[PDB]
């Protein structure tokens, strides 16, 4: 695939079987989704962004299906106005920022 | 150029001659830079990210040179923890996320 950036880079991912729309984000260190329930084996984490900081719930080894690929990656759950797949997953997929 | 997301993709841009480090961010609609003063000709706008909303000053037709490309575009200024070049800029440079 190729994402030209005219529209937001939005794709549907499957996190442990459940679909979600995610924004692929090159300026994100972590990936963070809201509105799914991933259980109780998480570690608490504090994540910062443009507006400030948020408590998040971190899960390691999550099974991710996106862009036909199937990764196991760390997913955080927290309050986000948009779900994001940050470099941790982008990297796993083999993505590149090109010019 | 290729930016393999194993490192934050930070680059140096010159905003009207002044150099600045910016993260190329696909997860950003707009470009926000802290620390430069661009004048009296602005429209106040509020932007949002994780953690919250931040007020900005919107400047139009700002001259930019980044990656041996010279472009003119919108730039906001605000108290951003890091300078962002968003989709409005990456689009103008003909950058893309490919897999």
């Amino acid at each position: 695939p190729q994402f030209s950036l005219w529209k937001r880079p939005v794709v549907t991912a499957y996190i442990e079987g459940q679909p979600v729309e995610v924004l692929l984000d090159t300026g994100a260190d972590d990936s963070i989704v809201a509105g799914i329930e991933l259980g109780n084996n998480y570690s608490p984490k504090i994540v910062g962004g443009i507006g400030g900081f948020i408590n998040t719930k971190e899960y390691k080894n999550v099974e991710i299906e996106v862009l036909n690929k199937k990764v196991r990656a760390t997913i955080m759950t927290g309050d986000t106005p948009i779900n994001i797949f940050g470099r941790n997953i982008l990297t796993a997929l083999g993505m590149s920022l090109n010019l | 150029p290729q930016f393999s997301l194993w490192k934050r993709p930070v680059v140096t841009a010159y905003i009207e001659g002044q150099p600045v480090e910016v993260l190329l961010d696909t997860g950003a609609d707009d470009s926000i830079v802290a620390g430069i003063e661009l004048g009296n000709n602005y429209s106040p706008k509020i932007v949002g990210g994780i953690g919250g909303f931040i007020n900005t000053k919107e400047y139009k037709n700002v001259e930019i040179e980044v990656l041996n490309k010279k472009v003119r575009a919108t730039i906001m200024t605000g108290d951003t923890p890091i300078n962002i070049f968003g989709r409005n800029i990456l689009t103008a440079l003909g950058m893309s996320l490919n897999l």
Binding site: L23, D25, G27, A28, D29, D30, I32, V47, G48, G49, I50, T80, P81, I82, I84, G86 | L23, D25, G27, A28, D29, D30, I32, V47, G48, G49, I50, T80, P81, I82, I84, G86
Partner: peptide, 6 residues
């Protein structure tokens, strides 16, 4: 909307 996310 801008997602920095450090």
């Amino acid at each position: 909307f801008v997602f920095l996310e450090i």
